[PDB]
Amino acid sequence: DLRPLVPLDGGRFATSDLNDLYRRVINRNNRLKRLLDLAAPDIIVRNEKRMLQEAVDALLDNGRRGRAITGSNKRPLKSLADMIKGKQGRFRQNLLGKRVDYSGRSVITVGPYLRLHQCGLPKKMALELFKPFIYGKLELRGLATTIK
Amino acid sequence: DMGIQVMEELMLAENTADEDAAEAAAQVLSSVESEIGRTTDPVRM
Amino acid sequence: AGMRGLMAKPDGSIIETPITANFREGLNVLQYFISTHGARKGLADTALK
Amino acid sequence: SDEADEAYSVTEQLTMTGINRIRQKINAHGIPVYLCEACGNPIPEARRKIFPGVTLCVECQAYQERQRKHYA
Amino acid sequence: NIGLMKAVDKFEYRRGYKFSTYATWWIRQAITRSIADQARTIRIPVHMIETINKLNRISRQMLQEMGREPTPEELAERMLMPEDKIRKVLKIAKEPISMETPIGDDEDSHLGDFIEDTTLELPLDSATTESLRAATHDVLAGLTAREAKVLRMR
Amino acid sequence: KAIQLHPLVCAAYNADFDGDQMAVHVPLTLEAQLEARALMMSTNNILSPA
Amino acid sequence: VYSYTEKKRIRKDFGKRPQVLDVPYLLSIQLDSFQKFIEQDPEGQYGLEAAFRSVFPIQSYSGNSELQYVSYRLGEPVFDVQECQIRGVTYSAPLRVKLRLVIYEREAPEGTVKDIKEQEVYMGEIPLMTDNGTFVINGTERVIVSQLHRSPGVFFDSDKGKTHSSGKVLYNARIIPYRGSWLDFEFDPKDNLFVRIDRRRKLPATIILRALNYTTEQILDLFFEKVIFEIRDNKLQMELVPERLRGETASFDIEANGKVYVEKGRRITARHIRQLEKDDVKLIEVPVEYIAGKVVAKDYIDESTGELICAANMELSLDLLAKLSQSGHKRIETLFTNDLDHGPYISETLRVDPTNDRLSALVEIYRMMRPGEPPTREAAESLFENLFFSEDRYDLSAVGRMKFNRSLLREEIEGSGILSKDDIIDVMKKLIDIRNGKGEVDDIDHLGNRRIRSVGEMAENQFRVGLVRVERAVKERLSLGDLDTLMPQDMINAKPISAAVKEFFGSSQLSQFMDQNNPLSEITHKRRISALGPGGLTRERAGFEVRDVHPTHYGRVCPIETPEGPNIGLINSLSVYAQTNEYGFLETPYRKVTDGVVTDEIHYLSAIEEGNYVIAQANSNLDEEGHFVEDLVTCRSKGESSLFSRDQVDYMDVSTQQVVSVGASLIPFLEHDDANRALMGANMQRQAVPTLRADKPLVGTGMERAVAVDSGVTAVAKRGGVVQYVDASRIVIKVNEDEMYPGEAGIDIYNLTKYTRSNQNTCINQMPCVSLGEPVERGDVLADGPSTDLGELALGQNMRVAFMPWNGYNFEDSILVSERVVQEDRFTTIHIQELACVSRDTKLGPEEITADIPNVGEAALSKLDESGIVYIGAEVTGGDILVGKVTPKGETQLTPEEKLLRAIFGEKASDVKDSSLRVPNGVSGTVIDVQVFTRDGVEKDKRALEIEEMQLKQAKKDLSEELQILEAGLFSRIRAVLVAGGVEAEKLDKLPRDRWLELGLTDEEKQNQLEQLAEQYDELKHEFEKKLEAKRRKITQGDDLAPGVLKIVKVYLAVKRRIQPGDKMAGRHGNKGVISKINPIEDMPYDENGTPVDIVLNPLGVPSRMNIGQILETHLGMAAKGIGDKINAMLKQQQEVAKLREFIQRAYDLGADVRQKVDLSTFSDEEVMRLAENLRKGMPIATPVFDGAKEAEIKELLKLGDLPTSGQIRLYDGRTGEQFERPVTVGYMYMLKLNHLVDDKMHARSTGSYSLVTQQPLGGKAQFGGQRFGEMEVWALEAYGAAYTLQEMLTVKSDDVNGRTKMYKNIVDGNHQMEPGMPESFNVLLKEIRSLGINIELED
């Protein structure tokens, strides 16, 4: 569920690139096991070990040893290191500033009649921000039997 | 990767590095000046 | 009310033909086109700032 | 305020400093030389009367102006 | 290479056949095999890949001939399938789009940010279950230990 | 459907009314809704910290 | 000189410059460009013919199977434009190529033609351009914005400043060809020319001169001059030149014949040169020490034993001077150099040239180009001769070769396409002289360096790309010599070509959604000039030379109309009169000025040739014969304008709108606005959403009509005639018989577009502005679309604004709008959303659109019909069910006590989940439409046939109405033919009408015409027959949906937004402001007459934001409505057409010498009452941009009404009834309503959806996701000590999955307190770090 493969509209799934990278590591690892248990010509075994090493490094930090691979749609597959680092990474963009509930947004106008501690909040924008408090206060005052 | 940063053409942002990786990349450069047969990628090796 | 004085090209190159008009009276085509230079430089600069 | 309202201050600073450096380039004081500091010839009365405190003849000024035009 | 070792242990001089034409037989076999096996995240078996390939090969043909485009009616015509498994085949062939697709938005957003969550129960629907637990504990308290115990147990 | 924002605060926000928008949040808990009352309130903040 | 439907509402035109050149077709760029593209002209003109001539024929690599190109054709579209808009498919035209494949069965002689295969293969569908220069690519309407990219040619840039940190400007030239390798000549901080072929190492600059077989001697003869020394009895006298010794320092005492001119140290005067010419001194005697430092010009050798005494580029010295005098040499030629003007650069660059002869030059070039390879004579000479000098590889195209010749001041406009040694040498010469001061570098933001592409050129380029891919693949196929068994169909594909042109028109940075909330948005987004996308710079790279406006923009690109913000100066927009050259450059017209008279013949000058001539100014009087009236006239010669002699100018400008775009021409009083204010004004005007009913500007600039007609929203006449039948849906035009073709009688018929959603969901619909039996003329407006009134662009409404504070309700830039403005519905807008309900096929089972929905009241299904979908016309509010749909869901595994609550009340658990399509929250509009698509071979429900039956009935009933129209017209023409010669008077009309096609007449050519009419009628019958058949077969076909879905139900909703506080309104002068109150009418500041102002605007926005245009337009609008109030009073207290005509004639002259000569005596008495009715609400007033009405004209027009000359009125408070001190400006100002509507900006959320991977608030209601509490806000809350606010703002309200559902309980339980826990962002980060090799753990 951190590298998920999710059903979209139309049956065409959606996957994070980590599945591609884990798959490329796993195929190459299984093939190295195969070739090792065939007594294969050791130059081919060298190539398999080298490719598996490159795959593990694309998995850990792509574009850090050679050129980013690849991706399947002609764009550099992002790896775990890319999942942490970068301006659009994880330490920065959902770790320090994230999306927030109980919040709205509207065009501000002036309204010079207000006292300096208060601001006009639309009724429609306030009935959505305080729905928990309103449900609680309704169920408390007995005006409504239950939360439903 | 050591810094300076390369471009193609008030350039005051920051340095980011370093006294540890500076001489590291400088050492790698001095060595790679003699790296003759050093493709260093799988498909060509 | 007064005059608009001397415009300036974006790289600081002050134009010698000065807009001797204000917005109350007209601005003919050439003076306006001269002023658009510094206008767009200022606009683009506050598009970065 | 609006993007057209700080752009004004930008353009204002720009033309102001431009005119400032250019009318500082002019010379208003008086130190009558009566002879160029490059070619030694007497700076004529006319040229030395237009710009008080001129320090070079006409042609030496043209030469140095061109040289600085290339920024060298 | 693995198929080549395979063919080298199965190459025969007794037919007097040159090595390349037969080892390349085995090699094309094994390479197409591994392509059909491990080239797609959601593994469709090899026969499904062959079927989508023959569908595609009869699709380019039916396009260049019929002008407009293939269709499941047309393809079930030209091919020998029942007009519905061809439907599911052409549903199957498409690749999962990457969840890091750069979306056409302002924040440099990606396709992985808009994939909502269909398993979570909304906190109005957990506070509409704890309220129900409290209500049933009340309404069961209004009852003998016979009914209360037997209903909590049943 | 438009927040009416007190005129004097607009120098604080650096905000005029040419179409600008603002975000509203609700300080939920007790300790968080005495901080909007005691620290982040509009009347306690009339001096610029600079 | 006004047509019949042109004295309806005549606009009193101020403006004194007569118009020499009427505004061209505004959409000319797009339309004629694609007409260039999809065109059959078999020559060198670009298009598809060019692409196929380029890529074909194809041949095998001596296998000789030639697949050659024969011809091609554009297959007609299978869907109409509107059906392509509806059914969600692009609007293409199949592209058939009659291809031919000759099998070269080669034995002899030299591969004769053996057998041939001709076949017509299909390769992609190319999208087509509609009548309005726009594409329909997926049902959406798109526009391919023209691109402005640099051109092939040679460019000299300096790279001043930051380079080298010594201050020294550098100077580099670049030859950038259309196709091949670049070629750079770069100076360097030590002055010596270099070379750099593409981006390789910088070889010296003499190496290429040597590669051209130039030895050192003629090289130094090329780049330098010559100083001559000879022993004329005194030790190598100098051969002196007068001019060359200017501005020098006296290296010695230059004297002659006893005449002492130059004393050494005494710097040279200009008097010195004047005297040296006044005496004519050429041979002089000099010190022998002067020749020491100079440089020889040719290799001086001796003849004793071939002694190489000195070679060229070898500086002399007194020892070598002795060696030169001893061997008896008289000639001593040296490079005349000097550090001011004749700088030594070739000399030093030879002294640093490590090469000496040609072949070493080639070998060093080779080691540069393809290193590692051991070079040789043959390979090196071949590499050089195939670098730039072989048509196979290099191509200076006609654009590039024109630029190249024109850039070096050549007169040949077209030469070779490959570089010559002459060309390269001349580039280096011009570069050295740009280093010398002779000339200065070009500004690469020039409009003479950047040429313009368009949709008819970029599409063709993508087609060439697809063609080259398919040609390589066809070579691959043909190389395997299969057999004669195949014609050129299986070797050719369509996925490549179709895919290339598709990925151009569908996903590109230049193929954008067309803006549609205006005639202005459409017509000014089809005229954009972007510098982004393919082949041009980008917002990332650029840049500040490109953002700016060069002097060459005058008449070519609007300097005031550009999208400000991120990409400003990157999306410049075309001007009004700007065409494109034959080469792609932007031309603007100038009236040729002969000897002294401005000839009325206009020349379209490009941006490169425009700097040579003295182009005059449009604000220039003329002595009624083309004669300038002033002594010296203001022109602009090379960028800088100035006063030039009257008999010196070569051109005059056409008009004064020649420099402002179409957008910035609709701004009254542009002359008086600060330029950034007009920029913001044009941009905001480009967003004025249409209103319920249109309203002409009370103050215009005359350009509204051109902009509205040139756009496509208006429905305008193809031929004049009489309007035979009007209707809300259609107009019918009995054509004037003169404009009627010989056969096929016919009468035109225009089916207007009623309500339909723009790209912005705003409403599109057309109203007939002509009444039954009204004479139309050709090129006239019959239907005024959205935002146009009688064919005049009308984005806003003229509201009575008073410039005054009023209690803070317009504080920063708010607008205080009265309640009569929302009462009278003069800013209500109609907005047409489209919702859709798709019934896909989930694994658990296909979904259904049944109206049996689980857990819903019997009021919720009141509006749905039997099959589930909503009724048409059902008024809806937020939450109502538009399309009841239920999905398969089984099982669910219900919990405990919910179990007991279903076992008690026995209400079963339904095996279906509710997922019906319901109206959004807040939206409230009638359902004006419902469209149901189905998968092919899926049972249409009861209500998908109530649409197709009605649709077939409508189609056949419309093609019946149209055939009755056409047959009525044909029978009318037949009867007219029988007016004489076969005239049956009164029972011909009684006879059977079918017994008219062959009636008895004098069988002259009249009977020929009648046989024409009869055969036309029968062809019309059959045409309507097959029209109805094809329409039926298209209506009754299974639509093709994307895979997985069965039926899509679309429901089009028509909400009516009303203006309210929060919404953003704006004048045209960039005075924006959100309307921040709706005042009762009795509070509005009214005047002594009693009338309330409608809008109240802050006065303080005029001085700071220097836009006097807005108050000037307040005054002129007050004048224009005052001239309308008098007309209205005269029209209600009926006087007669005489006195009303008198006043209108007064008000219509009313100015200085203006070209609006209108006289109300050529007007029929009832032609003056239509006019007098349409001037009842105020007369329009034209005011061309820099040719407007001057303030005296405004005051005079005020005095003609009965308003105060000061433009100011005393006004009383609406509330206290007292009089405002200091009278206020009150006038009618044209106010637009931008679609920054508050009904879209306002949203809010408490608990909604959450993302799946990063469990944060997601939303997706557009947008139910919460607000982004970014990083600066975290710092803002760390600044206060608000730790609890921050903590809940980043754990309980955002991320922590247990704490949030646990706190939603606590909020409801009356307990405001949280247990925060740990954010799933941090849990994910721990899992990812730990999923590396890093063990990261949490120490307890």
Ligand SMILES: [Mg+2]
């Ligand atoms: Mg603002």
Ligand SMILES: [Zn+2]
């Ligand atoms: Zn001097």
